[PDB]
């Protein structure tokens, strides 16, 4: 469950789920730990 | 275990330049450093 600014590793998430893995294999610049790679849009509310 | 962590640190140190933008289909670090791209296949492989 990637939900927070922290606690959202793609290298963890795309190994349990294959759907994130084919998402990252098509968009490899979201595999970065540094900024925010996108949460689900109800979870991704940065200004709130 | 230290050699595996060393290779982790090398990946960090030359994955500094990681920015959320693709241009054609490649991430920007694939544009930056030829060590992070498809073209640098490497010398030894066992499957493909």
CB–CB contact B20 A32 (8 Å): yes
Compute the radius of gyration of chain B from its Cα atoms. 13
Residues of A in contact with B20 (CB under 8 A): 29-30, 32, 35, 37
CA terminus-to-terminus distance, chain A: 19
Buried b / exposed e over B15-47, threshold 16 CB at 10 Å, is beebeeebeeeebbbbbbeeebeeeeeeeeeee
Note whether A21 and A15 are within 8 A (CB). yes
How determined?
Answer: cryo-EM
């Amino acid at each position: 469950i990637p939900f927070h600014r922290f606690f959202s590793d793609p290298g963890i998430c795309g190994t349990m789920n294959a759907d994130i893995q084919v998402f990252l294999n098509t968009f490899p610049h979201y595999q970065r730990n540094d900024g925010g790679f996108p949460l689900p849009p109800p979870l991704a509310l940065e200004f709130y | 275990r230290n050699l595996v962590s060393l290779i982790r640190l090398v990946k960090r140190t030359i994955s500094i330049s990681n920015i959320n933008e693709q241009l054609c289909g490649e991430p920007l670090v694939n544009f930056a450093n030829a060590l992070f791209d498809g073209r640098l296949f490497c010398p030894f492989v066992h499957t493909m």
